[PDB]
Structures are given as structure tokens and as C-alpha cells.
Amino acid sequence: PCPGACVCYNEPKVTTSCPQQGLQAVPTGIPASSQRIFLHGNRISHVPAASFQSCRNLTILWLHSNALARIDAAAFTGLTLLEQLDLSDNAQLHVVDPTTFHGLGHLHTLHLDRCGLRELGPGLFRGLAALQYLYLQDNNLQALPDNTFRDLGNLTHLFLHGNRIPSVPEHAFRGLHSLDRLLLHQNHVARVHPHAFRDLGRLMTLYLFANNLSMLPAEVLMPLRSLQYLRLNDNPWVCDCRARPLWAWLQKFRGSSSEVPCNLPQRLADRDLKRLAASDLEGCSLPKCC
Amino acid sequence: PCPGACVCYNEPKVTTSCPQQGLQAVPTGIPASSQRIFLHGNRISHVPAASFQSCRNLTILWLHSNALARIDAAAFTGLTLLEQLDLSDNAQLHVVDPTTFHGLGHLHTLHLDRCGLRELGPGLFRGLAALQYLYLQDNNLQALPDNTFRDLGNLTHLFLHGNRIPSVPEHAFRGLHSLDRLLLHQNHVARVHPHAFRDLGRLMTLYLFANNLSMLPAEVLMPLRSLQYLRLNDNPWVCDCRARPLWAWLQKFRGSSSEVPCNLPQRLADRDLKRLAASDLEGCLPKCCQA
Ligand SMILES: *[C@@H]1O[C@H](CO)[C@@H](O)[C@H](O)[C@H]1NC(C)=O
Numbered sequence: 146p147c148p149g150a151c152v153c154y155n156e157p158k159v160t161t162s163c164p165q166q167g168l169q170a171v172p173t174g175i176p177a178s179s180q181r182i183f184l185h186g187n188r189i190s191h192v193p194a195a196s197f198q199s200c201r202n203l204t205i206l207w208l209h210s211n212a213l214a215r216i217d218a219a220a221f222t223g224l225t226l227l228e229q230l231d232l233s234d235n236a237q238l239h240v241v242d243p244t245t246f247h248g249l250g251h252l253h254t255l256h257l258d259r260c261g262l263r264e265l266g267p268g269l270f271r272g273l274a275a276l277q278y279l280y281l282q283d284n285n286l287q288a289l290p291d292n293t294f295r296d297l298g299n300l301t302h303l304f305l306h307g308n309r310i311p312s313v314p315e316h317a318f319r320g321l322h323s324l325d326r327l328l329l330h331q332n333h334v335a336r337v338h339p340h341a342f343r344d345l346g347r348l349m350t351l352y353l354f355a356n357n358l359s360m361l362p363a364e365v366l367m368p369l370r371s372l373q374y375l376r377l378n379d380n381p382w383v384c385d386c387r388a389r390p391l392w393a394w395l396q397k398f399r400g401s402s403s404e405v406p407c408n409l410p411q412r413l414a415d416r417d418l419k420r421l422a423a424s425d426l427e428g429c430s431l432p433k434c435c
Numbered sequence: 436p437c438p439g440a441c442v443c444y445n446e447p448k449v450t451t452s453c454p455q456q457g458l459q460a461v462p463t464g465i466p467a468s469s470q471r472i473f474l475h476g477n478r479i480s481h482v483p484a485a486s487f488q489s490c491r492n493l494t495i496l497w498l499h500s501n502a503l504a505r506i507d508a509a510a511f512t513g514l515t516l517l518e519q520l521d522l523s524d525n526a527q528l529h530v531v532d533p534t535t536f537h538g539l540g541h542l543h544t545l546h547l548d549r550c551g552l553r554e555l556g557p558g559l560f561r562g563l564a565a566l567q568y569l570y571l572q573d574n575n576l577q578a579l580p581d582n583t584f585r586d587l588g589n590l591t592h593l594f595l596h597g598n599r600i601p602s603v604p605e606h607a608f609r610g611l612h613s614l615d616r617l618l619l620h621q622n623h624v625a626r627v628h629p630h631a632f633r634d635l636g637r638l639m640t641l642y643l644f645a646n647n648l649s650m651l652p653a654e655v656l657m658p659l660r661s662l663q664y665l666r667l668n669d670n671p672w673v674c675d676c677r678a679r680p681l682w683a684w685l686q687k688f689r690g691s692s693s694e695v696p697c698n699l700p701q702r703l704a705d706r707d708l709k710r711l712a713a714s715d716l717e718g719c720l721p722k723c724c725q726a
Pocket residue numbers: 177178199200201202
């Protein structure tokens with residue numbers, strides 16, 4: 146029995162589709178044989194505990210563009226075969242309990258973008274060993290703690306752009322051995338730890354533009370063996386003696402890199418660091434070469 | 436009498452080499468029998484017209500990494516057997532007279548990268564039908580005029596990355612029948628004419644990443660029958676109905692391509708267009724948006 150005004154059909158998968166119905170809550174009586182559930186475009190404000198626990202064969206769950214303000218920690222109990230979870234475009238969600246995604250060992254894609262998330266609680270992504278795509282962009286994250294993605298050994302795409310991340314700690318990207326694309330642009334990153342990119346040996350794309358980086362440590366880009374593309378524009382780069390290690394790296398980098406506009410001193414304003422000669426990077430708590 | 440700043444010999448070819456000498460100008464008294472001249476790594480600012488005109492057997496001329504601000508239109512007058520000319524790493528050059536490379540029917544490689552070239556004069560690459568490599572990357576090219584490489588029938592490599600080229604006209608690449616690699620990445624390319632790749636049948640590599648391409652007609656990739664490597668990433672792709680032709684092309688293309696990440700709409704942001712479904716490419720000036 147199909148609930149409400151939803152559409153229930155069997156091919157290509159058993160699907161319960163209830164998009165854009167003004168639903169205030171998850172409808173009861175969803176067929177337990179459902180493999181895909183589409184609840185996007187509604188006004189659902191909360192997801193109570195075990196809202197879909199009868200749908201053991203559920204692989205796809207869409208809840209984006211709702212009015213989510215609270216997701217119960219046990220909301221996804223019994224969904225061991227879930228592969229896709231779309232919770233995006235829920236600007237009033239703000240916080241997800243760190244135990245919410247536990248047990249989702251088959252989860253391959255997780256959409257948490259534009260949800261107003263303020264923090265990433267410890268253990269939020271624990272045990273998601275099959276995760277490949279993590280969308281965290283356009284939130285309100287003001288920190289990127291260590292070991293946040295420790296168990297995500299299969300993650301290939303991580304999107305953190307459009308947040309308020311102030312810095313990149315040493316073990317923020319630990320365990321991300323399969324990461325291919327890391328987009329951190331449009332944040333507030335004022336500093337990166339010297340060994341923060343240790344496990345990113347397979348990273349091909351790294352976006353760091355539109356941040357607040359004045360300098361980059363020495364050999365911080367050394368582990369990036371597979372790096373093909375690098376974006377460092379729109380940053381207050383200080384082009385004095387401290388910029389010599391980055392300048393020498395950009396001359397040897399056989400991949401593609403963007404412009405590195407200098408912000409200080411006044412005479413070198415809007416000058417690409419890659420074009421400059423080594424003689425221009427002379428002079429100056431302060432860096433060691435000062 | 437070899438110049439004191441230079442080292443002259445003739446074991447492979449007659450060579451007059453004076454690199455990294457701080458020379459203010461071209462040294463006088465260069466042996467006329469020279470087949471290779473290396474003036475790279477100095478502070479030469481001007482290349483007069485009477486220079487090198489005696490070296491009728493000159494094949495290699497190294498002038499990269501200098502302070503070149505002006506090169507006379509007849510600087511390479513009697514250099515008919517000149518095969519390689521390296522003028523790169525001269526940011527203060529800016530302009531090159533369109534008659535500079537006339538008569539160099541034996542020139543195989545031409546380095547003009549990192550010269551601050553703001554434009555490409557008409558007939559600049561005229562007659563250079565022996566040219567195979569053309570280095571124009573990392574300059575300030577604000578346009579790509581029609582028939583710019585019309586006579587470059589033997590050109591295999593064309594490097595045009597790091598400029599500010601806003602678009603690709605219909606006949607910007609006419610005559611490049613032998614073109615093998617075409618690097619147009621890191622520019623301001625916003626639109627490509629539907630027949631811009633007409634004569635690029637033997638093209639294998641095409642880089643268009645880091646540009647301003649919101650859409651790209653699938654008809655422009657039809658002539659590229661030899662295409663093996665395509666990079667379209669880092670573009671403001673709009674993945675709606677207008678991207679359906681480009682999408683169907685990526686499904687049939689069995690060569691290695693980069694990701695085509697969607698910039699708009701927001702729900703498809705950072706999603707690879709190749710991995711999307713045709714149902715995702717619906718809705719919305721493009722002709723499919725209005726109906
Ligand atoms: C789920 O799939 C299994 C195997 O196909 C089937 O036996 C079961 O009835 C389905 N529905 C459930 C567990 O609700």
C-alpha cells in the first residue's frame with residue numbers, strides 16, 4: 146500500500162517517490178521492500194529514530210531541500226546496505242550527531258553540503274570505509290580537526306570549499322590514501338601544518354585559492370606525488386625570503402599551477418611569484434630567514 | 436679571432452658560445468662560419484639589423500634568458516638556414532614586428548614563451564611551413580586572430596597556455612593539418628566557434644582546462660577523429676539542457692578525458708558530467724532553455 150500521494154513502482158528498483166508534496170514529516174507506511182526513497186523537496190523538519198528501519202534493502206535515500214533541523218542519532222538504523230545518502234540543502238540542520246552514520250558500511254556517497262554545519266564531531270565519519278564522495282561544501286565549518294577522515298581509506302573526492310576553516314592541522318587528512326580531488330578554496334585558511342599532506346600521495350587536484358595564506362611551509366607539497374593541478378591564487382602571499390622554498394618548488398613543478406599573486410611588499414603587488422627571479426625574494430615570531 | 440667572452444669550436448658544427456657572461460649587447464666579431472650561436476643568460480637589450488647577417492650557415496641561435504626589449508625587423512636577414520630560434524624568457528619584449536621571421540623557411544622550432552607578447556601581428560608566422568614547435572605560452576595574448584597559423588602546415592606542437600585568450604574564432608586554427616598537441620589551458624576562453632577544430636583531424640592532445648567555458652557545443656569535437664587526451668576540468672560548466680550534447684559526446688568518447696565538473700546548478704556542483712544521467716540534465720540564451 147503506497148502512502149499518501151507518493152508514487153510506488155518496481156522498476157528499475159522498488160521505489161517510494163514523494164517529492165515536492167509539502168510533507169511535514171517522513172510518511173508512515175513506506176513499503177518495506179523499498180530500495181530507493183525520494184523525499185526531497187518537502188518540508189520535513191526532523192528524522193526520528195528508525196524512520197526507515199523496515200527498508201532493509203534500501204540503497205538510496207534522498208532528503209535534500211527539506212526543512213531539516215534535527216536528525217536523530219538512530220535515524221538510519223537497519224540501513225546496512227545504504228549506498229547514497231543526500232541530506233544537502235538543509236540550511237537549518239547545523240549539527241549532526243557523531244553516531245548518526247555508524248553502521249553505514251556500504252555508503253559510497255554522502256551529501257552534507259549547504260546544511261549550515263558548524264562542526265564535524267569526533268567519530269562522525271568513523272567506519273565509512275566504502276565512502277568515495279564526501280560533500281561538505283557551502284556550510285559553516287570553523288575548524289577541520291585531526292583524524293576527521295581517518296577511516297575514509299577509499300574516499301576519492303572531498304569537497305570542503307565555502308566554509309570558515311581557519312587552518313589545516315597536521316592529521317586533518319590522515320588516512321585519505323585514495324583521495325584524488327581536495328577542494329579547500331573559499332575558506333579562511335591562514336596556515337597549513339608542514340606535514341598536513343602526508344597521506345595524499347594519490348592526490349591529483351588541490352584547490353587552495355581564495356584563502357588567507359601568507360606563506361606555505363617547506364616540503365609541505367613534497368608528499369603530493371601524483372599532483373597534477375594546484376590553485377594558489379587569491380591569497381595574501383608574502384614574497385620575501387620566506388617565499389623562496391615555494392618559489393623553488395614552483396620552478397620544478399612539472400604539473401600545472403595557477404598564479405601566485407604577491408601581497409607584500411608594496412612594489413611587488415599583484416606580481417606572480419612563479420615569474421619572479423630568486424633575487425626578488427630577499428629581505429623581510431617572524432620566519433627564520435628574517 | 437673569436438671574441439674573448441665566447442668559446443669557439445667546430446667539432447659537431449661551428450659553434451660560437453658565450454653564455455652567462457653579463458653581455459650588455461651582441462658581441463662584435465662573431466665568426467662568420469658559425470652554425471650555432473649561444474647568447475643565452477646575458478643582458479642583451481637590443482638585436483640590431485646587421486647582426487648575424489654574415490653567418491649564412493647558422494642553424495641554432497640561443498637568445499633566451501636576456502633583457503630583450505626590441506628586436507629589429509631585419510635582425511635575422513641572411514639566416515635562411517636557421518632551424519631553431521630561442522627568444523624565450525624576455526618579459527620586456529612585448530612586441531615583435533610581423534616581418535621578423537620572414538624568409539626563415541627552414542625554421543623548425545620557435546620559442547616565444549614568457550616574452551610578454553600582447554598580440555600576434557598579421558603574417559608573423561607566414562611562410563614558416565617547416566615550423567614544428569611553436570612556444571607561445573605564458574605571455575599576454577588577448578586575442579587569437581583568424582589564419583594566424585595558416586602557413587604552419589607542418590606544426591605539430593602549439594603551446595598557448597598562460598595567456599588571456601577570450602575565445603577561439605572559426606579560422607583561428609586553419610592550416611594546422613599536422614597539429615598533434617594543442618594546449619589552450621589557463622586562459623580566459625569563454626566560447627569556442629562550432630567549427631574551430633575543422634582542420635585539426637590529426638590532433639591527439641587538447642587541453643582546455645582552467646578557462647571560462649560554461650558550455651561547449653558537441654559539434655566542435657566532431658572533427659577531432661585522432662583525439663586521445665582531452666582535459667576540460669576547471670571550467671564553469673552549467674549542467675542543464677545545454678550540456679546534453681557535450682554529455683552524449685563524453686559517453687561515446689572512448690579516449691581518456693578529464694572530469695567535467697559542474698559549477699551550476701548547486702545540486703550538481705562538483706559532480707562529474709560524465710557520471711551524470713540524462714535525467715539530471717533537464718530544465719534551465721540557450722535554445723533549450725526557452726521551450
Ligand atoms: C529484501 O531483499 C531480500 C532478498 O532479495 C528479500 O528476501 C526481502 O523480502 C526483501 N525485503 C525486505 C527484507 O524487507
